[PDB]
Amino acid sequence: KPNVLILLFDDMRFDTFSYRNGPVSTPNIDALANEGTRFDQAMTSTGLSSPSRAAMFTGRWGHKTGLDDNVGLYHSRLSELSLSEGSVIKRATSIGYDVSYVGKWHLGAQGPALRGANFMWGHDKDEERNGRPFTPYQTQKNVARMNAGERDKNGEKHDYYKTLPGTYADTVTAKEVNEGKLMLQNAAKSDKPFFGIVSFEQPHPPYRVPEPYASMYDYKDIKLPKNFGIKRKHKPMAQDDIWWPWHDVSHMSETDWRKAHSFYYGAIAMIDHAVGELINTAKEEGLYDDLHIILVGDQGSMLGEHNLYDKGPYAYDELMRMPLIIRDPSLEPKIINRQVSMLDIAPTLRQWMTLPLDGDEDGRSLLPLMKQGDSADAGKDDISLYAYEWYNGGWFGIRAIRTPEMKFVWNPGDSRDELYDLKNDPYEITNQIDNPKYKKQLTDLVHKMAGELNRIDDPSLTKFNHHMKAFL
């Protein structure tokens, strides 16, 4: 029974790291990438926290678990992942793993402890279950101030980017690391197999770091991508609406957007130091050599691509794509360019740990890809499936199917679907849905989506067959 460490980050994009030729120097994450299996085309299940995490830890889609929206926020109906979903946590506990959890759970108060883990520390540890949804009255007042032309300390906008007082050592990140360190030290003192999860608040917006991370990257030198700052042309209505109060960016200057980038870059550099600290402790404790590691972000974050901030009910690559590294110490490093899913994590954990089955696996184990490379999946369609059922009590029922060359997004709460040519338009600027030159590719993607919805027993397949009846 191998020891397992999961390093799980909140809204960490795929593309920032120096190992991806990104603008931030990340030597410790780069070294883990180069020792392990790089999943360079990993996709999350949903660009939202609780759904992405329920998918990750159960191995089933939201329509099967019931966990299809964030919990505990205006105006979601949900409070917690059902305790009937044990997750990999209860399954690992059942076969003799000591499970430990540090940091943000976001699947209901006390959730890791209720499923048999040592919940060492985190926001969710000692909260009462079934709390009133967190309604963002303070964010609403602050964004009204920004629209009235006000700024916070030093010209900053604290709903987007913020210089924190003190040092790295005073940060929540330093505490997540210190608990990780204690988890590793304690595990080294037991004969018993260990399953450790460290869920970091970083780099969740607003992008908040102390010095020197706050000024490490000069806002004036940021390279803004081709889809930065644009008017959304023929895009669905849900991309326009102010779902969360900070989604009003009408007040944001190019300088505000550059600082969003520069402070995000600071957070990634601060994450790299944190990863280094935990890896080095694991080495000092004689655990690193045999440690089975997953480094993953629950989803990406928008830095003004399509004039969007944070995340919302959409499928653009900057949110849908996730960083993923899985290190099996028995295997030679490889780079997987075939698309993989957040639904593939739990099966990977299942094959490593010999977890008992607790029902369906909607994904597949990544072990064959890790051993054999992209050749494991030769012959097979290269597709990913993404859902955005809900955003914080708004229902959208969104589904996207992504090939290496094309993305089809179904928006059943709109009349307007999306079709992107990822080969000729990788920044997803032009919606080709009504473009007759793309009929053959649309038709192919509609059929692949109907196949995926059937495979996972999505009850929205009926409505899909109605909306897409021009193609069956």
Place this chain on the structure above:
Amino acid sequence: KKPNVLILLFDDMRFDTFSYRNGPVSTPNIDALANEGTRFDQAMTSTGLSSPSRAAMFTGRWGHKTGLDDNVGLYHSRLSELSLSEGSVIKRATSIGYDVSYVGKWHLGAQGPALRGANFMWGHDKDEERNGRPFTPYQTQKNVARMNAGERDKNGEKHDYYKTLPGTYADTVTAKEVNEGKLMLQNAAKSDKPFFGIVSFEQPHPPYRVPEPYASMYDYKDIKLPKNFGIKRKHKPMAQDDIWWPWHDVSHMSETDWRKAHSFYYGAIAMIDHAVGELINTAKEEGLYDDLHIILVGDQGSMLGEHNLYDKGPYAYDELMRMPLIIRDPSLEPKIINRQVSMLDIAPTLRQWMTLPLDGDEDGRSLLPLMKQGDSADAGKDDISLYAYEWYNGGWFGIRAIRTPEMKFVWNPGDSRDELYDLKNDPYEITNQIDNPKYKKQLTDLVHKMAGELNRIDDPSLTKFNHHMKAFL
């Protein structure tokens, strides 16, 4: 022995406009119906939204039982139609030998009246394909952007709020709904079979669009704006702030725009009164009126700037929650009912008139006892109404309100902030007393009445309610 039944169903018609309610619009034909029938002066809709209110009206069951708990066919609702397994009063009436005819807005899924055995004579929904793409308001969004840049439409108007239409009464959708109503009554007079007619008027749904002379009949300059007009919402839930539909952004509205919204609305009500007179006169000419069993009702009210709100949204304020209701039974003396009644009470009233067979639960009660006996039918019973706002066009809110003559408690389970209004001292619902310890006793009573109502109708949200209200339990 089985009575002829006519329903006149209006879209977003408020309770308070009519001259019989001492309202600002002269409505002699509705006034005459009110005087010959039973006035339900404290009628409440089930929901301030169209499809849910109409599913409740026609099935007699709450949306958690029918599945019809949001508008159909709109950004970004999940719904397209009432299940065909809900036959409604239409299928029930058909099965016992009623000729059922439907004119105008159904809003419960394309061809719905015809699938349930009605003659769907005319209406938006009559010839549509089922399972259509939701109508996404791209044009209304672009219009409201223009209004935010300080633009106006033709003649200084704002066509998402109020509009002078070209032509005359005779060119209007209302005139067509009336002509089809006239043909329904003419045809019914030729039949041995009992008749169940429904005329569902588009008016007076915003934007408030009428031809002359209705467009200028009421002078915007003379409108009396109520005490809750134009205010900053203090300690109100967040759902009242958000721009759910693009025209809910009223940051651009002048006091004159709001007065014109009133004055054009008043024009629509005067044009509705003419329409009602037309149909009542046809029914008298056809020798149907003397035995005709009639319901006049609006599916809900409409906000004209109370709490700085326009149209409707996920809230429970009286101007939206209250509905006009008149039920005329020709065998009975006129009465005024001040006891609260619900949209859930329509179907049971139809069931007792028509002897419709049971098709499952009735979440309301028949209004025949109140129509015969007056308010004292209910002596020794709590005077309550129950209101839900489960969804607004794909936003989930799960809202529930309990209203007594003196108090309203609104549960907002998608928020941390509930509402509590003293309707005796604050009937404009300006002050949220939820956190006011002087109102602990009234809150406690209303929480228990709500728990009882949720239990009575088997609402699955009762579990969450018990968690949110555990300080009571």
